[PDB]
Amino acid sequence: NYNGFDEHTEARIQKLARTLTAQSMQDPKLDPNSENFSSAAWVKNMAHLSAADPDFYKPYSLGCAWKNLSASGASADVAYQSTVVNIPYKILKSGLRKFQTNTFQILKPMDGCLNPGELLVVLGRPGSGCTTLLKSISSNTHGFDLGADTKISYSGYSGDDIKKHFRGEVVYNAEADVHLPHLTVFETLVTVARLKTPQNRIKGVDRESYANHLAEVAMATYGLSHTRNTKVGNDIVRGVSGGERKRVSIAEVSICGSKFQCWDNATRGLDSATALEFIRALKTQADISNTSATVAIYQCSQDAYDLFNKVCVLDDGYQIYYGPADKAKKYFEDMGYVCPSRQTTADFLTSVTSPSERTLNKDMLKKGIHIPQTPKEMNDYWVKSPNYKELMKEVDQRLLNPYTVSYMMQVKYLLIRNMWRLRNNIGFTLFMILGNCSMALILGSMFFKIMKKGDTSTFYFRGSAMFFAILFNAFSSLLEIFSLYEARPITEKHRTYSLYHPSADAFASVLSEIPSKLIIAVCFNIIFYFLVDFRRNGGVFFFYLLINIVAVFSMSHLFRCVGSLTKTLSEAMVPASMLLLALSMYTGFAIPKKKILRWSKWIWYINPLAYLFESLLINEFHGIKFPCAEYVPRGPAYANISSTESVCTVVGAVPGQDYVLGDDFIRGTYQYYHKDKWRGFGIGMAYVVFFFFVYLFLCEYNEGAKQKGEILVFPRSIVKRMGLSKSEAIFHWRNLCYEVQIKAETRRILNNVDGWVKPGTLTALMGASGAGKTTLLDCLAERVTMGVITGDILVNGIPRDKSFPRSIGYCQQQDLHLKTATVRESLRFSAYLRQPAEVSIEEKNRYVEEVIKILEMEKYADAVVGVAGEGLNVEQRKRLTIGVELTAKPKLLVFLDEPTSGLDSQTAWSICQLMKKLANHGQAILCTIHQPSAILMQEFDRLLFMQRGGKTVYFGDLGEGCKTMIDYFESHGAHKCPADANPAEWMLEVVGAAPGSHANQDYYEVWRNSEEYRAVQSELDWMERELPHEFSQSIIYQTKLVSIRLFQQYWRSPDYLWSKFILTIFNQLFIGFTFFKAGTSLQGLQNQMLAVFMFTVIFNPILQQYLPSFVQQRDLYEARERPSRTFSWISFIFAQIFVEVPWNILAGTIAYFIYYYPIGFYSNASAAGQLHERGALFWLFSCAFYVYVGSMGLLVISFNQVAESAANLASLLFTMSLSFCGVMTTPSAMPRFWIFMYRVSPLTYFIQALLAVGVANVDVKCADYELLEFTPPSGMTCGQYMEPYLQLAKTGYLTDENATDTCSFCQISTTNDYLANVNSFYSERWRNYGIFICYIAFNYIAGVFFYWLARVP
Ligand SMILES: Nc1ncnc2c1ncn2[C@@H]1O[C@H](COP(=O)(O)OP(=O)(O)OP(=O)(O)O)[C@@H](O)[C@H]1O
Ligand SMILES: Nc1ncnc2c1ncn2[C@@H]1O[C@H](COP(=O)(O)OP(=O)(O)O)[C@@H](O)[C@H]1O
């Protein structure tokens, strides 16, 4: 626990000061070693030492005064939900409404003043304008605008002053949880203390020693010195606790030296003890550094409220009170509202703004004196108050009278921090290194057997191997965008502190990835270059290595720029995919620079990979003569030949040559000239530098954070215009015990628990964290999977059946609903699937309307659930949860887990009122309650109080004012309950884990031996004597409803569908028009092969775009719908399949139309008289490919938990399939080992069939440079000369069969002969289609099976 600078921390800070000064030496009030030390002065000295630099004019302390502070913002309309059809018009409308609005008064004029060293607390129900006030007084006024009369002064400096010259002294923190998960607390603080060492003025101690001491004192002051070596952690990363993480925020801003602070959601997710610790850390900072700190908080504890100097109270943007915290209660008591004895003053002030919870004074209503009731009247009363006169007499008097370290040091310290991140999360780094190296080994091994010979038969494979080398080197670095997005929030926070240039963070993040890039570019390249057997000269190898290093750095900087412009990785996967396709496909291998069309030659000219690949090919081919592999006149009749009467079958060949010069081959095929060897390096370095600087400039400026109104979405159709079933049976349990085996061998978590719930009764379940409240609720609701349960649960004395889970409603604490569904649609979905099938749908609709009316939500009964930020809010989301569990007509009970937790006192009271209403309608509610107020506690009928380990201490009716419980506890030697004490806190103090957690005795024993225990046992015996289809709907009906809901999710998911379709359109149109009418020359056929190959590379983006949808539906299902027995996993998976399939078919049809015809396959079909059949088969293959991408996404996401891991696995499998497809290396040249991968990969059959359907059954038309030129023997024309050869090699043709001087010879006479080399046959098209369909079926079946394995209990 943290007690706010208590003597412990004074001693520990003296220890730290002794350490520092002894190290350095290697007035007595400030001397660590001599007696009479004062740690408070010591730390305070440091505050001066960093603030009072004679060269930095930062103020010692900033107050704040503000009068007439009005804040207004653009009115909040109802934004109709975006669907996949209406979003284009929405976009156009938004564009016209942004180029060519009425306002809402967020905050009515306010006054106030916060002096240095004071704590201000802002109270008010959500929506009252607390966040806007904090942003206004801290000058973070973006998304709204202040009035012309607003006068705000920071002890002389205007808002326009701190906004420029002192920004970072005035800080607003919407959250105190944003941190870097993998840095330890000490690392997180020492990096900041290094960036904030006034190092030009400290003498006698190394800058690092002083930074260490400063971070150590910051941990000591704020109670974190135990977490020195613990990872700061996160929600998903275990580490320090939430309270300790918020105190790390406090210590970090303390080191940063801010003077005016605002904490908006300070104690979100914190129980009273931890929230009080946080407020105590703020108080410690206030009196150690003189920092005025404002906070907005909910359910402020009285012990936490006492710490606050001043209170501001808001109501609908009106200021009802501003003054000392200890006078607010009395001020509102004079106004005419009476505080119930057991109400904390924070709760009293916040409830005075709640028409249904205020207790107006009757005495002043006897004499008929006016009491303001509406917020306008309360403000009109305050402005007339005498307290307002005092406050203004102070505010008037108050108004009438960049970085500590250089840029290089900032870069150095942030680089050290980045390395700390790397070695604290090394696993990802090792994954990158080893995955790249192993892909190197595999893919290079694929090239092992063919490069040994070194003949001219290896030229295409040399091209393709160099293509692989450059692509892999270029795109290896792309995993660091994850770290970029992970660090952006922290960079923004540290920017709002005048802590460092964001350019410094960008530059340091670039530098921290160099070691990984070099390790990869060494290991991968050594393995690949050795195995692929490129030129063995050391010089050429090192030139290759340098080119690859330049490639990786250029692409890393380009995609850092691309990621910088985007907000989330999902928003970047589309443009990044477009750039990836362009760069990869115009690199010079998929389409030689000769073959590129006039419309897209500029792409090749601006592609750094193009020049780098040119340099690589020049390096690999230049100057080495390759012996010939086969000459075109061949066989028996062609043994006696003169040199000039036979060529090599390769582009650069010359008749009579024993070899081909690689230079000629590249000049002819690619048009690369040795004079361009070093141009590629120069241009690559130019782009490296330019995009590095663009990345810095983008990270420096293009950032922002804007405010937004709480907007309901209300689907467009709406926007155009705009009883209960009694719980029937008693439920009870007896001698219930529970055990697990995970954290220990037979670790008990519920121990001899017993009790009951009856119709029309509200029973609270209480106990400190742990104590198995949620565990007991899960055990009773038959909701647990692990552990074993003994003791008997019963309904009317009979064991609970196997249909029991459908008779109980269980409202989970962390409610989760389909974010696209509306409230009414969600309720009706719940009713349609859970209520009995014999009930008509009209009756279910009527009941849903009745439930909507009961819970008071017809004002938002057609609102979209949305997210926590937009759509519904916490209160309305909890109301929807309760309604969803109610609309299933639970026969027996409604279990509620912590329905109030996380809310403010007024909405928690509204929830408790709803629960009491339901218990009055006839329901039987057993709700778990966490740290309730006395007013909330009063509403409950019965109480079941447990100790840690689920040891029941008191079961019974608590009675009025909790008097029965108080009497039971007092009558057994408990210390009495003070008349102002909350009874729940009192009983957790009597026995529990509350601060002061010592119990004079163990009260489980007292219960066991009590009178009430025997009363409970007698009643439970009498109930035992009183006793005298796993789903509600058929699997088909469940699948119908679930698939309908998923279709309504895809529709209304415009981002997913439109990213899918525009990615398909761009990628496929770009492939089609890059190879626009590629023709039927020998290079044309190869270009069409590589085009059909590029068609597949849309695999990964489509799968990754898809996976989040399944993950969302899966989270909803597993969390809520599975335990509720709403529908079976069969229905869930079949919906995930049926919905995905049609959209993928549509995408495949679009791709077919924009790919088949532009590339020219249709003319190839027509010339063969096979137009319609080949077109239909090509369209079938396109649709099958997209359906296959969907099915493989399902297969990988079925058993994987996170989407990213499933995407990585799918990418690995697709890489294997594509690499061994037989296109980058023919199976003949493949090593004997890898043929299995060439047989099992679906893309072999897909691409073989698709290229056969594209180019087969037409005549080859060799281009001028492709034709072989030689001369015939004496006296015979080339027809006679070549006739014997054509007799055997039944393919090839002569341009002039009768020519006698020199003849041009094309190897292949028909595209079928070329395809046979690729092993693609037009006779196997339908067989290959069948094989691909079987692949799709296997994917879906295996995905269903793996979901049943890894996920279904
Ligand atoms: N442009 C705008 N900016 C901010 N709020 C706006 C705007 N337009 C309307 N509002 C509304 O004004 C009210 C101001 O409340 P504000 O969000 O400032 O405090 P709060 O919501 O009580 O605090 P918290 O965000 O901590 O819950 C909100 O209900 C919001 O929906
Ligand atoms: N991984 C686990 N395996 C087995 N039991 C667990 C595990 N995690 C938590 N528990 C048990 O479940 C309890 C958490 O739920 P519970 O305590 O009922 O919620 P609350 O703390 O709100 O009452 C813990 O006290 C612990 O005894």
Tell whether residue 1034 is among the known ligand binding residues: no
Query: Structure resolution in Å?
Result: 2.8
Q: Any idea which ligand is nearest the CA of 898?
A: 2
For helices 983-990 and 963-970, what crossing angle results, to 10°? 20
- Which among 72, 106, 142 is the best mutation to test ligand 1's pocket, defined by most ligand atoms within 8 Å of the CB? 106
Residue nearest to atom 24 of ligand 1 (CA): 131
Any ligand 1 atom below 6 A from CB of 131: yes
**Quick check: is 388 in a domain?**
no
Radius of gyration of the chain (CA): 38
* Phi, psi (degrees; rounded to nearest 5) at 1067: -55, -50
Is 1290 a member of any domain? no
Q: Which of 303, 322, 341 delimits the end of a domain?
A: 322
Whether 1301 contacts 1271, CB under 8 Å: yes
Q: At what angle do helices 426-446 and 407-424 cross, to 10 degrees?
A: 70
Method by which the coordinates were obtained: cryo-EM
- Residue in 774, 930, 948 to alter for ligand 2 test, most ligand atoms within 8 A of Cβ: 774
**Pair (955, 1079) in one structural domain:** no
Task: Please report, for residues 324, 808, 1147, the alpha-carbon distance to residue 1063 in angstroms, rounded to integers and kept in the order given.
Answer: 60, 46, 10
Angle among Cα 95, 96, 98 to the nearest 5 degrees reads 65
Determine whether 711 is exposed, middle or buried from the number of CB atoms within 10 Å of its CB (0-12, 13-18, 19+): middle
- Which residue CA neighbors atom 5 of ligand 1 most closely? 709
Q: Would you give the DSSP letter of residue 891?
A: S
Which burial class, exposed, middle or buried, applies to 1236 when counting CB atoms under 10 A from its CB (0-12, 13-18, 19+)?
exposed
Residue 1036 lies in a domain: no
Beta pairing class for 625-627 and 151-154: unpaired
Give CA–CA dist 876/872, Å, rounded.
Answer: 6
Nearest Cα residue to atom 11 of ligand 1: 709
Please tell me the distance between residue 107's alpha carbon and the centre of ligand 1 in angstroms: 9
Task: Kindly give the distance from the C-alpha atom of residue 316 to the centroid of ligand 1, in angstroms, as a whole number.
Answer: 9
* Separation of first and last alpha carbons in the chain: 40
SS3 category, 748: strand
Evaluated on CA atoms 636, 640, 641, 647, the torsion sign reads positive
Domain stops at, among 1025, 1040, 1073? 1025
Q: How far is CA 100 from the centre of its chain?
A: 35
Which atom of ligand 2 is nearest to 778's Cα? 18
* The two three-digit tokens of residue 861, written as one number: 């009964």
Q: CA-CA distance, 529 to 466, in Å (whole number)?
A: 9
- Check the annotation: does 774 bind a ligand: yes
Neighbours of 847 (CB within 10 A): 22
Residue 168 labeled ligand binder:
no
**Closest alpha carbon to 1159 in 1253, 1235, 1243:** 1253
Proximal ligand: closest to the CA of 101: 1
Ligand 2 center to 775 CA (angstroms):
6
Of 869, 888, 907, the one marking the end of a domain is 888
Statement to judge: residues 1076 and 1219 lie in one domain: yes
Residue 962 and residue 850 share a domain: no
284 is in an annotated binding site: no
Task: Please check if 704 is assigned to a binding site.
Answer: no
Q: Is 705 in the pocket of ligand 1 (CB under 6 A)?
A: no
The DSSP secondary-structure symbol of 181 reads T
Spell out which residues line ligand 2, taking CB within 6 angstroms.
740, 742-743, 749, 769-775, 786
Q: Is 773 annotated as a binding residue?
A: yes
Query: What is the rounded distance in angstroms from the CA atom of residue 1261 to the CA atom of residue 1293?
Result: 10
**Does 760 reside within a domain?**
yes
- Same domain for 884 and 995, yes or no, is no
Q: Is there a contact between 906 and 820 (Cβ–Cβ < 8 Å)?
A: no
Nearest CA to ligand 1 atom 7: 709
The number of the ligand 1 atom at minimal distance from the alpha carbon of 74 is 1
314: CA distance to ligand 1 center in Å?
12
Q: CA angle, 204 as apex, 201 and 210 as ends, to 5°?
A: 70
Take residue 313 and report the two structure tokens written for it: 């109270």
Check whether residue 857 and residue 783 sit in a common domain.
Answer: no
Query: Does residue 237 sit within a domain?
Result: yes
Ligand 1 probe mutation, 102, 103, 121, 130, most atoms within 8 A of CB: 130
- If you take atom 12 of ligand 1, which residue's CA is the nearest one? 106
Of 389, 317, 284, the closest CA to residue 133 belongs to 317
CA 1257, distance to chain mean position in Å, is 51
> Which of 745, 749, 766, when mutated, tests ligand 2's pocket best, judged by the most ligand atoms within 8 Å of its CB?
749
> How many structural domains is the chain composed of?
6
Was 771 annotated as part of a binding site? Answer: yes
Structural domain including 798 reads 726-807+890-1025
Rounded CA separation 343/445 (Å): 76
What ranges in 873-933 are assigned the alpha helix state H? 874-886, 905-921
The answer to whether 1096 and 1185 are in contact (CB under 8 A) is yes
Distance 106 CA to ligand 1 centre (A): 7
Enter the DSSP assignment of 631. Answer: B
Q: Which atom of ligand 1 has the smallest separation from the CA of 128?
A: 22
Ligand 1: nearest atom to the Cα of 265:
26
**Nearest atom within ligand 2 for CA of residue 772:** 18
231 and 149 assigned to the same domain:
yes
Residue 875 in any domain: the answer is yes
- 3-state DSSP assignment of residue 5: coil
Looking at the fold, whether 1064 and 1173 belong to one and the same domain comes out as yes
Question: Both 776 and 875 in a single domain?
Answer: no
Q: 1064 and 951 in one domain?
A: no
CA of 699 to the centre of ligand 1 (A): 29
Residue 912 counted as domain residue: yes
Question: For residues 684 and 1300, is the Cβ–Cβ distance under 8 A?
Answer: no
Could you give the 3-state DSSP secondary structure of residue 795? Answer: strand
CA of 929 to the centre of ligand 1 (A): 29
Of all ligands present, the nearest one to the C-alpha of 765 is: 2
Residue 599's CB is within 10 A of a number of other CB atoms, namely: 10
Helix or strand holding residue 543 (H, E): helix 538-565
CATH number, domain containing residue 169: 3.40.50.300
984 Cα to the center of ligand 2, angstroms: 22
Ligand 1 center to residue 1025 CA distance, Å? 57
The residue written with tokens 């094309």 in the block is 1306
How far is Cα 1248 from Cα 1327, in angstroms, rounded to an integer? 11
Choose which residue among 238, 738, 740, 751 to substitute to test ligand 2 binding: the one with the highest number of ligand atoms within 8 A of its C-beta: 740
What is d(CA 1069, CA 76) in angstroms, rounded to the nearest whole number?
A: 41
CA of 670 to the centre of ligand 2 (A): 67
75 in a structural domain: yes
Residue 28 DSSP class:
G
3-state secondary structure of 237: coil
Q: In whole angstroms, what is the distance from residue 1310 CA to residue 1314 CA?
A: 7
Q: Tell me: do 981 and 1106 sit in the same domain.
A: no
Q: Output the CA 709–ligand 1 centroid distance in Å.
A: 6
Cβ-Cβ contacts under 8 Å for 721 (sequence gap 6 or more): none
Do 1322 and 1231 lie in one domain? The reply is: yes
| Whether residues 480 and 508 fall in one domain | yes
**Does residue 143 line the site of ligand 1, with CB under 6 A?**
yes
Q: Among all chains, which residue has been given the structure tokens 């907005």?
A: 296
Rounded-to-integer distance, Cα 431 and Cα 923, Å: 55
The residue type at 706: K
Atom of ligand 2 nearest to the CA of 898: 22
Consult the annotation and say whether 642 binds a ligand.
no
Query: Are 340 and 894 within 8 A, CB to CB?
Result: no
Cα angle 91, 95, 98 (rounded to 5 degrees) comes to 135
Which residues are CB-contacts of 448 (< 8 A; sequence separation ≥ 6)? Answer: 531, 532, 533, 1231
C-alpha distances out from residue 306 to 1, 302, 335, Å: 18, 6, 22
Tokens of 1022: 């009498």
How far is the centre of ligand 2, averaged over its atoms, from the C-alpha of 749 (Å)? Answer: 8
- State whether residue 1334 is helix, strand or coil: helix
129 in contact with ligand 1, CB cutoff 6 A: yes
Q: How far apart are CA 485 and CA 90, in angstroms?
A: 28
For residue 1107, the Cα-to-chain-centroid distance in whole angstroms is 13
Mutate to test the pocket of ligand 2, among 739, 743, 814, 895 (most ligand atoms within 8 A of CB): 743
Mutate to test the pocket of ligand 1, among 710, 711, 860, 906 (most ligand atoms within 8 A of CB): 710
| φ and ψ of 484, to 5 deg | -55, -50
